[PDB]
Write a protein that binds this ligand. Sequence first.
Ligand code: NI
Length: 341
Amino acid sequence: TCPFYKKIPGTGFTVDAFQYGVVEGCTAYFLTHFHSDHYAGLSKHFTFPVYCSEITGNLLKNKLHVQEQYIHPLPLDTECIVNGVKVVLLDANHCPGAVMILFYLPNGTVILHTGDFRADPSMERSLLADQKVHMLYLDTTYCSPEYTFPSQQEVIRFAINTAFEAVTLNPHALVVCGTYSIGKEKVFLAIADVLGSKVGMSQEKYKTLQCLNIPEINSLITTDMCSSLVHLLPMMQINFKGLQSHLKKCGGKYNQILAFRPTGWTHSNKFTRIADVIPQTKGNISIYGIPYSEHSSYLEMKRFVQWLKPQKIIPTVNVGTWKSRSTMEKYFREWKLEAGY
Ligand code: NI
Protein backbone atom coordinates (compact mmCIF):
# COMPACT_ATOMS: atom_id res chain seq x y z
CA THR A 1 0.00 0.00 0.00
CA CYS A 2 1.09 3.48 -1.15
CA PRO A 3 2.32 5.82 1.63
CA PHE A 4 0.78 9.30 2.17
CA TYR A 5 3.86 11.32 1.22
CA LYS A 6 3.56 9.85 -2.42
CA LYS A 7 0.01 11.00 -2.95
CA ILE A 8 -0.99 14.45 -4.25
CA PRO A 9 -4.28 15.51 -2.52
CA GLY A 10 -7.11 16.73 -4.66
CA THR A 11 -5.79 15.01 -7.75
CA GLY A 12 -5.72 11.60 -9.37
CA PHE A 13 -1.89 11.77 -9.13
CA THR A 14 0.99 9.85 -7.50
CA VAL A 15 4.72 10.46 -7.49
CA ASP A 16 7.36 7.68 -7.67
CA ALA A 17 4.71 5.05 -6.78
CA PHE A 18 5.16 2.02 -9.06
CA GLN A 19 5.80 -0.80 -6.47
CA TYR A 20 2.34 -0.91 -4.89
CA GLY A 21 0.32 -2.44 -7.79
CA VAL A 22 -2.73 -0.52 -9.06
CA VAL A 23 -3.13 2.51 -6.70
CA GLU A 24 -6.85 3.22 -6.02
CA GLY A 25 -7.91 6.37 -7.84
CA CYS A 26 -4.64 7.04 -9.69
CA THR A 27 -5.21 8.33 -13.23
CA ALA A 28 -1.57 9.47 -13.86
CA TYR A 29 1.70 8.21 -12.32
CA PHE A 30 4.59 10.72 -12.30
CA LEU A 31 8.20 9.56 -12.29
CA THR A 32 10.75 12.23 -11.13
CA HIS A 33 13.91 10.37 -12.31
CA PHE A 34 15.39 7.05 -13.44
CA HIS A 35 16.84 5.76 -10.12
CA SER A 36 15.78 2.24 -9.04
CA ASP A 37 14.31 3.08 -5.60
CA HIS A 38 11.92 5.51 -7.49
CA TYR A 39 11.04 3.44 -10.59
CA ALA A 40 10.72 0.10 -8.50
CA GLY A 41 7.85 -1.78 -10.16
CA LEU A 42 7.79 -0.46 -13.74
CA SER A 43 8.22 -2.99 -16.71
CA LYS A 44 6.94 -3.72 -20.34
CA HIS A 45 3.60 -4.89 -18.82
CA PHE A 46 2.73 -1.49 -17.28
CA THR A 47 -0.50 -0.09 -18.91
CA PHE A 48 -1.19 3.30 -17.08
CA PRO A 49 -0.06 6.81 -18.26
CA VAL A 50 3.44 7.73 -16.99
CA TYR A 51 4.45 11.41 -16.98
CA CYS A 52 8.14 12.36 -16.95
CA SER A 53 10.95 14.19 -18.69
CA GLU A 54 12.13 13.36 -22.33
CA ILE A 55 15.32 11.75 -20.92
CA THR A 56 13.45 9.61 -18.39
CA GLY A 57 11.07 8.59 -21.16
CA ASN A 58 14.05 7.44 -23.39
CA LEU A 59 15.26 5.27 -20.49
CA LEU A 60 11.77 3.75 -19.75
CA LYS A 61 11.35 2.73 -23.43
CA ASN A 62 14.95 1.39 -24.07
CA LYS A 63 16.05 0.03 -20.71
CA LEU A 64 12.75 -1.14 -19.08
CA HIS A 65 10.74 -1.66 -22.44
CA VAL A 66 7.69 0.23 -21.32
CA GLN A 67 5.48 0.56 -24.39
CA GLU A 68 5.50 3.86 -26.20
CA GLN A 69 1.74 4.45 -25.89
CA TYR A 70 2.00 4.78 -22.07
CA ILE A 71 5.03 7.21 -22.08
CA HIS A 72 4.10 10.91 -21.77
CA PRO A 73 7.22 13.14 -21.93
CA LEU A 74 6.82 16.87 -21.00
CA PRO A 75 9.16 19.76 -21.80
CA LEU A 76 10.73 21.62 -18.91
CA ASP A 77 9.86 25.19 -17.83
CA THR A 78 6.47 24.98 -19.62
CA GLU A 79 2.92 25.16 -18.24
CA CYS A 80 1.14 21.84 -19.21
CA ILE A 81 -2.42 20.62 -18.51
CA VAL A 82 -2.60 17.00 -17.31
CA ASN A 83 -6.03 15.46 -16.67
CA GLY A 84 -7.42 18.95 -16.09
CA VAL A 85 -4.64 20.18 -13.71
CA LYS A 86 -1.83 22.66 -14.54
CA VAL A 87 1.71 21.25 -13.92
CA VAL A 88 5.30 22.43 -14.55
CA LEU A 89 8.51 20.28 -14.64
CA LEU A 90 11.72 22.00 -13.37
CA ASP A 91 15.34 20.80 -13.56
CA ALA A 92 16.23 19.12 -10.19
CA ASN A 93 20.09 19.42 -10.53
CA HIS A 94 20.26 15.65 -9.67
CA CYS A 95 21.01 13.09 -12.45
CA PRO A 96 20.17 13.41 -16.18
CA GLY A 97 16.43 13.73 -16.76
CA ALA A 98 15.61 14.45 -13.06
CA VAL A 99 12.79 16.90 -12.32
CA MET A 100 10.85 18.70 -9.61
CA ILE A 101 7.09 18.96 -10.23
CA LEU A 102 4.91 22.08 -9.51
CA PHE A 103 1.20 21.21 -9.17
CA TYR A 104 -1.46 24.05 -9.32
CA LEU A 105 -4.43 22.36 -7.60
CA PRO A 106 -8.01 23.13 -8.63
CA ASN A 107 -8.74 24.65 -5.16
CA GLY A 108 -5.87 27.29 -5.42
CA THR A 109 -3.19 25.41 -3.37
CA VAL A 110 0.29 25.18 -5.02
CA ILE A 111 2.47 22.07 -4.23
CA LEU A 112 6.22 21.61 -5.08
CA HIS A 113 7.58 17.97 -5.08
CA THR A 114 11.41 18.21 -5.29
CA GLY A 115 11.97 14.54 -6.18
CA ASP A 116 15.68 14.05 -5.50
CA PHE A 117 17.53 17.42 -5.93
CA ARG A 118 20.68 19.36 -5.25
CA ALA A 119 19.43 22.84 -4.27
CA ASP A 120 21.09 25.76 -6.04
CA PRO A 121 20.66 29.59 -5.95
CA SER A 122 19.79 29.45 -9.69
CA MET A 123 16.45 27.87 -8.66
CA GLU A 124 15.51 31.19 -7.04
CA ARG A 125 15.17 32.43 -10.77
CA SER A 126 13.11 29.70 -12.27
CA LEU A 127 9.27 29.77 -12.52
CA LEU A 128 9.33 29.36 -8.67
CA ALA A 129 9.97 33.12 -8.31
CA ASP A 130 6.45 34.04 -9.52
CA GLN A 131 4.20 32.62 -6.74
CA LYS A 132 3.61 31.14 -3.37
CA VAL A 133 3.96 27.41 -2.38
CA HIS A 134 1.65 25.99 0.26
CA MET A 135 3.20 22.45 0.55
CA LEU A 136 6.83 21.31 -0.10
CA TYR A 137 7.55 17.55 -0.48
CA LEU A 138 11.30 17.76 0.27
CA ASP A 139 14.38 15.53 -0.46
CA THR A 140 15.83 15.50 3.10
CA THR A 141 18.66 12.98 2.39
CA TYR A 142 21.28 15.21 4.15
CA CYS A 143 19.09 17.18 6.54
CA SER A 144 21.62 17.52 9.44
CA PRO A 145 24.46 20.02 9.88
CA GLU A 146 27.22 17.38 9.90
CA TYR A 147 26.58 16.80 6.24
CA THR A 148 29.11 19.01 4.47
CA PHE A 149 30.86 18.37 1.11
CA PRO A 150 32.50 20.62 -1.60
CA SER A 151 30.95 22.03 -4.79
CA GLN A 152 30.82 19.67 -7.77
CA GLN A 153 33.26 22.07 -9.61
CA GLU A 154 35.94 21.66 -6.80
CA VAL A 155 35.56 17.87 -6.86
CA ILE A 156 35.99 17.76 -10.66
CA ARG A 157 39.02 20.10 -10.44
CA PHE A 158 40.61 17.58 -7.95
CA ALA A 159 39.87 14.53 -10.16
CA ILE A 160 41.15 16.18 -13.48
CA ASN A 161 44.42 17.33 -11.78
CA THR A 162 44.99 13.95 -10.08
CA ALA A 163 44.43 11.93 -13.27
CA PHE A 164 46.45 14.29 -15.56
CA GLU A 165 49.41 14.26 -13.12
CA ALA A 166 49.46 10.45 -12.77
CA VAL A 167 49.21 9.65 -16.49
CA THR A 168 51.81 12.34 -17.45
CA LEU A 169 54.28 10.77 -14.98
CA ASN A 170 53.35 7.27 -16.26
CA PRO A 171 51.92 7.00 -19.85
CA HIS A 172 51.26 3.34 -19.10
CA ALA A 173 48.72 4.00 -16.25
CA LEU A 174 44.98 3.17 -16.80
CA VAL A 175 42.26 5.22 -15.16
CA VAL A 176 39.13 3.38 -13.92
CA CYS A 177 35.84 5.05 -12.69
CA GLY A 178 33.05 3.19 -10.80
CA THR A 179 29.32 3.51 -11.65
CA TYR A 180 26.01 1.79 -10.54
CA SER A 181 23.27 4.06 -11.79
CA ILE A 182 22.89 7.14 -13.98
CA GLY A 183 24.27 10.38 -12.50
CA LYS A 184 27.81 11.71 -11.88
CA GLU A 185 28.80 11.36 -15.59
CA LYS A 186 30.92 14.59 -15.33
CA VAL A 187 33.52 12.57 -13.25
CA PHE A 188 34.53 10.17 -16.07
CA LEU A 189 33.76 12.67 -18.92
CA ALA A 190 36.03 15.39 -17.46
CA ILE A 191 38.93 12.98 -16.81
CA ALA A 192 38.71 11.48 -20.36
CA ASP A 193 38.62 15.01 -21.89
CA VAL A 194 41.90 16.09 -20.09
CA LEU A 195 43.59 12.83 -21.21
CA GLY A 196 42.49 13.05 -24.86
CA SER A 197 40.67 9.73 -24.68
CA LYS A 198 37.14 8.37 -25.23
CA VAL A 199 35.61 6.53 -22.27
CA GLY A 200 35.39 2.74 -22.68
CA MET A 201 32.55 0.67 -21.20
CA SER A 202 30.20 -2.35 -21.53
CA GLN A 203 27.51 -2.47 -24.17
CA GLU A 204 24.84 -2.25 -21.39
CA LYS A 205 26.33 1.05 -20.03
CA TYR A 206 26.85 2.49 -23.53
CA LYS A 207 23.14 1.86 -24.18
CA THR A 208 22.18 3.77 -21.06
CA LEU A 209 24.43 6.81 -21.94
CA GLN A 210 22.96 6.88 -25.43
CA CYS A 211 19.50 7.72 -23.89
CA LEU A 212 20.73 10.90 -22.11
CA ASN A 213 20.78 13.68 -24.82
CA ILE A 214 24.39 14.58 -24.00
CA PRO A 215 25.73 16.83 -26.84
CA GLU A 216 28.38 15.24 -29.06
CA ILE A 217 28.19 11.92 -27.04
CA ASN A 218 29.40 9.87 -30.03
CA SER A 219 32.69 11.81 -29.81
CA LEU A 220 33.06 10.99 -26.07
CA ILE A 221 32.33 7.25 -25.41
CA THR A 222 32.96 3.80 -26.91
CA THR A 223 32.55 0.06 -26.50
CA ASP A 224 36.09 -0.58 -27.78
CA MET A 225 37.92 -0.95 -24.51
CA CYS A 226 41.35 -1.41 -26.06
CA SER A 227 41.35 2.00 -27.75
CA SER A 228 40.50 3.86 -24.46
CA LEU A 229 42.60 4.72 -21.36
CA VAL A 230 39.60 5.66 -19.16
CA HIS A 231 37.42 2.58 -18.41
CA LEU A 232 34.08 2.37 -16.58
CA LEU A 233 33.31 -0.58 -14.35
CA PRO A 234 30.51 -1.49 -12.04
CA MET A 235 31.01 0.06 -8.55
CA MET A 236 31.29 -3.38 -6.94
CA GLN A 237 34.46 -4.12 -8.88
CA ILE A 238 36.20 -0.97 -7.44
CA ASN A 239 38.43 -2.84 -4.95
CA PHE A 240 41.98 -4.32 -5.06
CA LYS A 241 40.72 -7.79 -6.19
CA GLY A 242 38.44 -6.51 -8.90
CA LEU A 243 40.99 -4.10 -10.29
CA GLN A 244 43.81 -6.74 -10.32
CA SER A 245 41.51 -8.93 -12.28
CA HIS A 246 40.67 -6.13 -14.70
CA LEU A 247 44.44 -5.25 -15.32
CA LYS A 248 45.12 -8.90 -16.30
CA LYS A 249 42.51 -8.57 -19.09
CA CYS A 250 44.24 -5.59 -20.75
CA GLY A 251 47.02 -7.73 -22.31
CA GLY A 252 50.08 -6.03 -20.73
CA LYS A 253 49.09 -2.64 -22.16
CA TYR A 254 49.13 -1.09 -18.66
CA ASN A 255 51.24 -1.48 -15.47
CA GLN A 256 49.32 0.77 -13.01
CA ILE A 257 45.61 1.60 -12.21
CA LEU A 258 44.37 4.81 -10.75
CA ALA A 259 40.63 4.38 -9.77
CA PHE A 260 37.89 6.69 -8.61
CA ARG A 261 34.80 5.84 -6.42
CA PRO A 262 32.35 8.62 -6.45
CA THR A 263 30.46 8.24 -3.20
CA GLY A 264 27.97 10.44 -1.48
CA TRP A 265 29.03 11.89 1.89
CA THR A 266 31.34 9.76 4.08
CA HIS A 267 32.54 10.67 7.68
CA SER A 268 36.08 11.43 6.36
CA ASN A 269 34.23 14.68 5.19
CA LYS A 270 34.09 15.71 8.90
CA PHE A 271 37.92 16.03 9.09
CA THR A 272 39.54 16.29 5.63
CA ARG A 273 39.48 19.03 2.96
CA ILE A 274 39.08 17.94 -0.69
CA ALA A 275 42.68 19.10 -1.38
CA ASP A 276 44.05 16.82 1.40
CA VAL A 277 42.34 13.57 0.15
CA ILE A 278 44.62 10.57 -0.23
CA PRO A 279 44.01 7.18 -1.79
CA GLN A 280 44.12 3.60 -0.59
CA THR A 281 47.08 1.88 -2.24
CA LYS A 282 48.18 -1.76 -2.77
CA GLY A 283 51.21 -2.11 -5.02
CA ASN A 284 50.56 -0.69 -8.53
CA ILE A 285 46.77 0.04 -7.63
CA SER A 286 45.47 3.26 -6.03
CA ILE A 287 41.72 4.02 -5.20
CA TYR A 288 40.38 7.52 -4.47
CA GLY A 289 37.00 8.05 -2.77
CA ILE A 290 35.69 11.37 -3.96
CA PRO A 291 32.62 13.19 -2.41
CA TYR A 292 30.67 14.04 -5.56
CA SER A 293 27.07 14.67 -4.35
CA GLU A 294 23.87 14.98 -6.41
CA HIS A 295 21.87 15.83 -3.25
CA SER A 296 21.68 19.13 -1.30
CA SER A 297 24.16 19.77 1.54
CA TYR A 298 22.50 20.88 4.79
CA LEU A 299 23.41 24.54 4.06
CA GLU A 300 22.12 24.41 0.40
CA MET A 301 18.81 22.84 1.66
CA LYS A 302 18.33 25.42 4.38
CA ARG A 303 18.97 28.28 1.96
CA PHE A 304 16.42 27.02 -0.51
CA VAL A 305 13.68 26.43 2.05
CA GLN A 306 14.28 29.83 3.83
CA TRP A 307 13.91 31.45 0.34
CA LEU A 308 10.77 29.52 -0.72
CA LYS A 309 9.00 29.98 2.70
CA PRO A 310 6.57 27.09 2.40
CA GLN A 311 3.57 26.86 4.68
CA LYS A 312 4.11 23.12 5.37
CA ILE A 313 7.07 20.68 4.72
CA ILE A 314 6.61 16.89 4.12
CA PRO A 315 9.96 15.03 4.08
CA THR A 316 10.41 12.23 1.55
CA VAL A 317 13.76 10.73 2.88
CA ASN A 318 14.74 9.43 6.34
CA VAL A 319 11.07 9.00 7.30
CA GLY A 320 11.26 5.49 8.81
CA THR A 321 12.48 6.32 12.41
CA TRP A 322 10.99 8.50 15.12
CA LYS A 323 14.41 10.03 15.90
CA SER A 324 14.92 11.02 12.20
CA ARG A 325 11.48 12.55 11.95
CA SER A 326 11.93 14.51 15.22
CA THR A 327 15.41 15.81 14.23
CA MET A 328 14.04 17.06 10.84
CA GLU A 329 11.01 18.79 12.46
CA LYS A 330 13.38 20.66 14.82
CA TYR A 331 15.46 22.03 12.00
CA PHE A 332 12.37 23.12 10.00
CA ARG A 333 11.22 25.14 13.10
CA GLU A 334 14.64 26.71 13.59
CA TRP A 335 14.70 27.75 9.93
CA LYS A 336 11.19 29.26 10.13
CA LEU A 337 11.95 31.25 13.40
CA GLU A 338 15.29 32.51 12.07
CA ALA A 339 13.81 33.81 8.77
CA GLY A 340 10.39 34.91 10.18
CA TYR A 341 7.84 33.09 7.99
NI1 NI B 1 18.02 9.70 -7.00
